[PDB]
Amino acid sequence: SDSKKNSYSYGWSFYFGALSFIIAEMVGVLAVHMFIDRHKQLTG
Amino acid sequence: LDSGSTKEFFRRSKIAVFDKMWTYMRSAEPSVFVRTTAEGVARVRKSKGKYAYLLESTMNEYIEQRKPCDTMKVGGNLDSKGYGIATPKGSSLGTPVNLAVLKLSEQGVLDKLKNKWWYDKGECGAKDSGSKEKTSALSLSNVAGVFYILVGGLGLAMLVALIEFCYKSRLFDRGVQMLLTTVGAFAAFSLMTIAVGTDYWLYSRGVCKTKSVSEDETSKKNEEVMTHSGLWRTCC
Amino acid sequence: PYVMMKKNHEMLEGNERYEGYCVDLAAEIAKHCGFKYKLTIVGDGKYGARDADTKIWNGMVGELVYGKADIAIAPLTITLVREEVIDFSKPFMSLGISIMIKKPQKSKPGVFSFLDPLAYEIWMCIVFAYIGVSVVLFLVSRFSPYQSSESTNEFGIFNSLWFSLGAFMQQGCDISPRSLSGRI
Amino acid sequence: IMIKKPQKSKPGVFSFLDPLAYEIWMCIVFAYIGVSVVLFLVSRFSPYSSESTNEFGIFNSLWFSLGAFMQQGCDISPRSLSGRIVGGVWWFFTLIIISSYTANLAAFLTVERMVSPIESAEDLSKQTEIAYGTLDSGSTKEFFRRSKIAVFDKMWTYMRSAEPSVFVRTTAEGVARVRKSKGKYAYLLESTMNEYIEQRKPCDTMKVGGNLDSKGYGIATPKGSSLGTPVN
Amino acid sequence: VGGVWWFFTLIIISSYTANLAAFLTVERMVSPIESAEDLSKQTEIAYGT
Amino acid sequence: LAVLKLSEQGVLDKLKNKWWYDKGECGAKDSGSKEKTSALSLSNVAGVFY
Amino acid sequence: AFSLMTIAVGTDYWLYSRGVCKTKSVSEDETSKKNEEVMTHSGLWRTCCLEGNFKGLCKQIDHFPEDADYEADTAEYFLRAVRASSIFPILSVILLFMGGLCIAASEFYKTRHNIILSAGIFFVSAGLSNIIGIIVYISANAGDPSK
Ligand SMILES: NS(=O)(=O)c1cc2c(cc1Cl)N[C@H]([C@H]1C[C@H]3C=C[C@@H]1C3)NS2(=O)=O
Ligand SMILES: N[C@@H](CCC(=O)O)C(=O)O
């Protein structure tokens, strides 16, 4: 039930895909902020 | 045991598992062999699970049902042996003694006497304490980590407030933000390509070249060994 | 428990001296076959083995071979060399070599035991799903509403984090989305 | 079978305070006070009328944590980053504590029986922790030694090896032997005597299972008695 | 006043929703008539001989 | 004597355990779930994530 | 409050229980008959019994035993070392003393205006150390409860 005999372990590839998730969410937020400044610049 | 039937079987064992046990026994200090069986029982109890003893099953069941109930039998039968009544050659009652054994076996009296003496005359009789089912109030130690996280969250909140207060007592730039976004985009693409492409997703027991052909039964097949399975490939 | 000395074995005499499973078995074999039996405990106290150079069966097997003992209702395993000289019964009881460990002491001071019912995969997926919902809501709201209408909403990225956490913690939040995709 | 009754413990008016230990109730109040103090400290650091922007006084901070703990929620919301930190951790604290209380309370509401007493004579046979005796020179004792039902024969076997001797001299002594052992011991007698005694004081006895056999009490006359047929 | 009422409603609802599912799917028999004296005081269920 | 010799060499055991276990290509699954109640699985809730 | 905390540290009336007293303070003792474990005022470090034949005598608790019945668990080993070397209650007393220093110098050292602020931080940080010292004491007493 815990698969303790299988002893499944998520290797460095699995962690890097998680790191790919975290960076991509951060980059997307930064990208929106750069738009908001530029769209505010368009209004000005 | 120092000298016993258990000692002789692992000597005669051709199994690689038993031989590796047998190699350890020949070359381990302090000497894993014990002079008597009662010594080995006391030694395991004294060594607190760091030392374990190989003995016959009926003995091991008997030690459990006595006190202080602090030993556990584990595993199955490594090999099968039997206890036979001994009579000399040309025995006058030897064949009726065999018939008497068969009758007590078929009537079940052999097991009924066996199941009684081990499990009832035993001091432990653990069925009663094993039948204890009582829900209780939660203790503080059962949830003590939740209290620890709260305190750690409190002290962290103070520290962040102090360093923010210092920084307020003391400017992000757009071009710096653009450069950071370029670097993050390149890195996240790089991390994603490495993850899908290179295959180290899971570390578990899995099937390797001993059975790379799934079709071949290849009797024991070395059941399955450690395997760095991944998204596109499985590898050992 | 095959042969047992009782606390009154000093009082008792003869067949009543010793009790146990094999003593019961000796009594049971007696009544089926019909023989009066004499219980003895051998002095050597060692299982039957033919010696190296004297080549004498040591203990119970020797006493049966050398005519002193009629029968051995004893915890005697059947080996090849023993069966070769004297015939054994079919084995009345079976045995196997077993592993005995000192019983591992049982308790769960689990200290981080609060995150036990969900597996660590599920906690990981929740945290990822927490971050995703917070980002999407910020991306939805601050997506060029049209000066003022850009800055009308209070859902910044920091507020969007706070909104979802209180929603996860089943706690009321100060702000509400007030946009169709945001309310979705 | 005659055993001593279990305790019908009458719970006090504070039965709701059962699922959490009283140390935890003390610790929760202590943790409640500290978090409210910390949050007021965090909300008022004299930032760089910037302190006046925060509405959190101590009395607000007491109020915010209470609505968090009772899960009802409050109007005011922390707006500084460290102020949000202490609130979210306290929210995570509350979520465990309240749910663990409700889960254990549901477990305490589900009450069941037959675990603490003995189910029947087979359950008497399965555990000798509660030992059992019979009356001296009684037909009850004579039945169990001569009934070859397997539970009865194992029950006669432990009667043969029982120290101190489970057999009693009189009925009232065997009744008293149930009482004097504080529920660690049981006894055997007829159903009709047990029914009377359980309805008499100190009313601490009851009959588990049912009567194992059926018997009769009859008027007794000697063999070939002249008065045998009229009393029939 | 609000605090004591909040402590009140926490206990009551947690008591109410403790085993609420078990009190919607109990299908057990009523068995209103039990004994002879219970049969005696009513005529609605008739006596058969 | 032949049966005894194979038993003391494990030949009876080696033949028995080889035929039964290795022709068990089906997973044995006498265990299933040994504990009565166990932790939540992602499989039980993965649709909600979808 | 500094006085209250120091008296709390310097006393042994933390827990009353049917603990082992001085008669069974001697290990593996013969014919003591276990002495039926008369009341014991357990302490921050002291296992002194009260209301006994052998009350009035004080022995320190040694929480690490000669014989570990359970196999040595790392997280429990950390928790015991916290309780025995009671550094969290000791650090609380120090922070109480540090605030008391700040309180005494609050009248003096004009134009800092943050001495009183440093005192309040020390007061809360002392209080945080008190709770966690309390919690480990409850957790240790829960650890090996008894019969
Ligand atoms: N449970 S027991 O010890 O009473 C017991 C032990 C054994 C039994 C039967 C019983 Cl009931 N069968 C065999 C024997 C009975 C007949 C079948 C195989 C031989 C002849 N010996 S055994 O494997 O030693
Ligand atoms: N009727 C019973 C009463 C005593 C008993 O139950 O042992 C008898 O005469 O033996």
Curated annotation (Swiss-Prot), chain A:
Superkingdom of origin: Eukaryota
Membrane-crossing segments per the record: 16-32
Cellular localization per UniProt: Membrane
Subunit structure: The L-type calcium channel is composed of five subunits: alpha-1, alpha-2/delta, beta and gamma. Acts as an auxiliary subunit for AMPA-selective glutamate receptors (AMPARs). Found in a complex with GRIA1, GRIA2, GRIA3, GRIA4, CNIH2, CNIH3, CACNG2, CACNG4, CACNG5, CACNG7 and CACNG8. Interacts with AP4M1 and GRIA1; associates GRIA1 with the adaptor protein complex 4 (AP-4) to target GRIA1 to the somatodendritic compartment of neurons.
Family: Belongs to the PMP-22/EMP/MP20 family. CACNG subfamily.
Function: Regulates the trafficking to the somatodendritic compartment and gating properties of AMPA-selective glutamate receptors (AMPARs). Promotes their targeting to the cell membrane and synapses and modulates their gating properties by slowing their rates of activation, deactivation and desensitization. Does not show subunit-specific AMPA receptor regulation and regulates all AMPAR subunits. Thought to stabilize the calcium channel in an inactivated (closed) state.
Stated name of the protein: Voltage-dependent calcium channel gamma-3 subunit
Organism name: Rattus norvegicus (Rat)
Gene: Cacng3
Residues of the full protein shown: 167 to 207 of 315
UniProtKB/Swiss-Prot annotation, chain C:
UniProt tissue specificity: Detected in forebrain. Detected in dendrites of neuronal cells. Expressed in the pyramidal cell layers of CA1 and CA3 and in the granule cell layer of the dentate gyrus.
Site (Interaction with the cone snail toxin Con-ikot-ikot): residue numbering on this chain: R50
Stretches of the chain forming a coiled coil according to its record: none
Localization: Cell membrane; Postsynaptic cell membrane; Postsynaptic density membrane
Intramembrane segments as residue ranges: 155-170, 171-173
Induction and repression of expression: Down-regulated in the pyramidal cell layer of CA1 in the hippocampus by global ischemia.
Topology feature Cytoplasmic, residues: 174-179
The organism's place on the tree of life at top rank: Eukaryota
UniProt-annotated binding residues for L-glutamate: P75, T77, R82
Transmembrane segments: 120-140
Post-translational modification, as annotated: Palmitoylated. Depalmitoylated upon L-glutamate stimulation. Cys-173 palmitoylation leads to Golgi retention and decreased cell surface expression.
Lipid-binding residues (covalent, S-palmitoyl cysteine): C173
Domain notes: The M4 transmembrane segment mediates tetramerization and is required for cell surface expression.
Assembly and binders: Homotetramer or heterotetramer of pore-forming glutamate receptor subunits. Tetramers may be formed by the dimerization of dimers. May interact with MPP4. Forms a ternary complex with GRIP1 and CSPG4. Interacts with ATAD1 in an ATP-dependent manner. ATAD1-catalyzed ATP hydrolysis disrupts binding to ATAD1 and to GRIP1 and leads to AMPAR complex disassembly. Interacts with GRIP2. Interacts with GRIP1. Interacts with NSF via its C-terminus. Interacts with CACNG2, PICK1 and GRIP2. Interacts with GRIA1 and SYNDIG1. Part of a complex containing GRIA2, NSF and NAPA and/or NAPB.
Similarity comment: Belongs to the glutamate-gated ion channel (TC 1.A.10.1) family. GRIA2 subfamily.
Additional remark text: The postsynaptic actions of L-glutamate are mediated by a variety of receptors that are named according to their selective agonists. This receptor binds AMPA (quisqualate) > L-glutamate > kainate.
Protein name: Glutamate receptor 2
Name of the gene encoding the protein in the UniProt record: Gria2
Parent-protein residues present: 425 to 621 of 883
UniProtKB/Swiss-Prot annotation, chain F:
Tissue expression summary: Detected in forebrain. Detected in dendrites of neuronal cells. Expressed in the pyramidal cell layers of CA1 and CA3 and in the granule cell layer of the dentate gyrus.
PTM info: Palmitoylated. Depalmitoylated upon L-glutamate stimulation. Ubiquitinated by RNF167, leading to its degradation.
Subcellular location: Cell membrane; Postsynaptic cell membrane; Postsynaptic density membrane
Protein induction: Down-regulated in the pyramidal cell layer of CA1 in the hippocampus by global ischemia.
Annotated site, Interaction with the cone snail toxin Con-ikot-ikot, chain positions: K5
Chain's role: Ionotropic glutamate receptor that functions as a ligand-gated cation channel, gated by L-glutamate and glutamatergic agonists such as alpha-amino-3-hydroxy-5-methyl-4-isoxazolepropionic acid (AMPA), quisqualic acid, and kainic acid. L-glutamate acts as an excitatory neurotransmitter at many synapses in the central nervous system and plays an important role in fast excitatory synaptic transmission.
Domain remarks in the Swiss-Prot or TrEMBL record: The M4 transmembrane segment mediates tetramerization and is required for cell surface expression.
Record's miscellaneous remark: The postsynaptic actions of L-glutamate are mediated by a variety of receptors that are named according to their selective agonists. This receptor binds AMPA (quisqualate) > L-glutamate > kainate.
Family designation: Belongs to the glutamate-gated ion channel (TC 1.A.10.1) family. GRIA2 subfamily.
Protein name stated in the entry: Glutamate receptor 2
Originating organism: Rattus norvegicus
Highest classification ranks of the organism: Eukaryota, Metazoa, Chordata, Craniata, Vertebrata
Residues of the full protein shown: 769 to 818 of 883
